[PDB]
Amino acid sequence: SGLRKMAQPSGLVEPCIVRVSYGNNVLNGLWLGDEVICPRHVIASDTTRVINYENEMSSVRLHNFSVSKNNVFLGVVSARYKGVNLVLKVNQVNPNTPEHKFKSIKAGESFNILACYEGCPGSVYGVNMRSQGTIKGSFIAGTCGSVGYVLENGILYFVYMHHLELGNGSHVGSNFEGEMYGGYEDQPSMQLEGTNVMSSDNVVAFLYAALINGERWFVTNTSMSLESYNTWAKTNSFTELSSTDAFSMLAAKTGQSVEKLLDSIVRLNKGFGGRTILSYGSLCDEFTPTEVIRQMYGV
Amino acid sequence: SGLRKMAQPSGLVEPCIVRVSYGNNVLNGLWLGDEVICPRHVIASDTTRVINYENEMSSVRLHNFSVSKNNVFLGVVSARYKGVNLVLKVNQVNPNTPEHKFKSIKAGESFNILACYEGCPGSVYGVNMRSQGTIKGSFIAGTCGSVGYVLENGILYFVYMHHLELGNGSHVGSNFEGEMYGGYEDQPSMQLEGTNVMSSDNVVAFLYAALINGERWFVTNTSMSLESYNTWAKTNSFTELSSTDAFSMLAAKTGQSVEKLLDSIVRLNKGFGGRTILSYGSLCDEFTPTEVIRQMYGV
Ligand SMILES: */C(=C/C(=O)OCC)[C@H](C[C@@H]1CCNC1=O)NC(=O)[C@H](CC(C)C)NC(=O)[C@@H](NC(=O)[C@H](C)NC(=O)c1cc(C)on1)C(C)C
Numbered sequence A, B: 001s002g003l004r005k006m007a008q009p010s011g012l013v014e015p016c017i018v019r020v021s022y023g024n025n026v027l028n029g030l031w032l033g034d035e036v037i038c039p040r041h042v043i044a045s046d047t048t049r050v051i052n053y054e055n056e057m058s059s060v061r062l063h064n065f066s067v068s069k070n071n072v073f074l075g076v077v078s079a080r081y082k083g084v085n086l087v088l089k090v091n092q093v094n095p096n097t098p099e100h101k102f103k104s105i106k107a108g109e110s111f112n113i114l115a116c117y118e119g120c121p122g123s124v125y126g127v128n129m130r131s132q133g134t135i136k137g138s139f140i141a142g143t144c145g146s147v148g149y150v151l152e153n154g155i156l157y158f159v160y161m162h163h164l165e166l167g168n169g170s171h172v173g174s175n176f177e178g179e180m181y182g183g184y185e186d187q188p189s190m191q192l193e194g195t196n197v198m199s200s201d202n203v204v205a206f207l208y209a210a211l212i213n214g215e216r217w218f219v220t221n222t223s224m225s226l227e228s229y230n231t232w233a234k235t236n237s238f239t240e241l242s243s244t245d246a247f248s249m250l251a252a253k254t255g256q257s258v259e260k261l262l263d264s265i266v267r268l269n270k271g272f273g274g275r276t277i278l279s280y281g282s283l284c285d286e287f288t289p290t291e292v293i294r295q296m297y298g299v
């Protein structure tokens, strides 16, 4: 076919999602146990202008909050700021809480996103952590608080919650420890992202996958050592390769070694001229060896 | 927010998915009410040689099957052909059956896929029905029985099951009417597909997306009238575009009209000349207007 960006399934998350409001602010909250996490800015009286939190947490009549799963409401007990995330102890443990574990995504790691609009999940798509800690999601008005999750061996991990969008378009969110990814703040301010660093690990996988679906026009006898490639890497914003390991697998199923790809990269780093790979016209790093292996002829 | 192929939640569908064996043959199945639906080739003795489904059904014996969710088995009390879909009556009603209707997908229409392996849901991704009634499902071995479905107004529609992959890589499945999309057959026989006919509506949606995602190079002050475009199309493997009416929303939001984008197509169809569009190296038609609107600035 191609290679296409899948998402792992979502049924385990959908019940834990709710509609948290507060004033004119309607968004989505995650509901695990008697807790309900969500972007803090829901409290803020005017999100369209620099925010003074603290101040805002000082006159927040808990009775005004408004949580609901479908048209079935919930009562609020406490609420504690935790990083950029807001916590709400509700008066009704969630019967659908999924066995899980929290973590955070390192750059170049793929993960699923479940965009929601006022408590209702609307779509499911996988994404990827850019070097600067932002994602090219596809968020818009009302998807704040959407949840991002991963599964690694029957373990459902919660890793992301959506907050805001940069001036350039990139989407910013927090991990569940209350940490906004990329250190960005929850302020309608002009904040920069800084150059994006292409994930080498992930670009190699992309090329392997290409071979796999019978695509080779971009592979020629000639090769670069991790050394060499590594240099160039440091000049054209590509992560660096530590061990040609990882790909031994693919390197076998296709006989071609990384070395032969690192060269490809460099040739390809300035357009495919008129050709394409897996339908892509430029190099892509949204996939990880895991995905190529799991997606392609494999587990 | 660039443009990503998304899927709709897998929540409702995920329970419904079961594992079916008969023989050396294992796949996936769908469990609704007291019935389980799965490809009838499950029963075919040797699935690598021409099959006679009537000789096979002739030697079928219930106790020879196997149906289960998790490791909990169900008792088959009946099995039958309805076209190419094997329907199986079992001793138990799925308590998790969701309010559902059935339906058929038309060319150019998109829908969600839950690629499953031996009973377990493993991923969700959107797809698009090609002119020839096939799709580029990223289907592998062990995915047979994978279910397709859509959600409209809040009604769940089951519309696809999987069966086989053509010699050209494309993927063929069946509607729940027991009909094989494309009129293909569950025979390991050499069946061609026939040159593909792109979706003009979907391609226009695509270009609108790009414009909304801030791309313009391919923009010129040129325009091709409707009738003019359709004559070009009918001889260029693009579908007749019978109504710019579907494009009013996007048109007003970008300032560009279908006719301007029409000419863009005739031009761009001659290869992007080296550049890319929304990262693709050539034209895409796997995005309906509906998706682009809903997905971009709009509902
Ligand atoms: C979710 C909330 C929503 O629906 O609010 C309606 C009022 C957004 C999600 C956002 C919508 C589009 N895609 C998305 O992901 N949350 C926000 O609106 C945040 C709120 C802050 C309190 C954190 N706002 C923004 O993302 C906005 N970002 C900008 O502020 C960027 C940084 N800024 C600019 O470069 C600039 C100038 C001015 C004035 O405001 N921003 C976005 C501009 C709406």
Ligand SMILES: */C(=C\C(=O)OCC)[C@@H](C[C@@H]1CCNC1=O)NC(=O)[C@H](CC(C)C)NC(=O)[C@@H](NC(=O)[C@H](C)NC(=O)c1cc(C)on1)C(C)C
Residues within 6 Å of the ligand: B026, B027, B041, B044, B047, B048, B051, B139, B140, B141, B142, B143, B144, B145, B162, B163, B164, B165, B166, B167, B171, B185, B186, B187, B188, B189, B190, B191
């Ligand atoms: C899902 C089943 C599975 O579990 O297989 C276990 C072997 C079905 C999956 C395929 C695999 C790749 N993607 C995908 O969707 N498929 C089957 O294996 C079917 C079964 C038969 C009984 C319908 N077979 C195929 O899809 C084959 N299709 C071919 O028949 C193709 C048309 N081939 C030729 O031109 C030709 C010549 C001979 C001999 O066979 N095909 C593929 C080739 C396995």
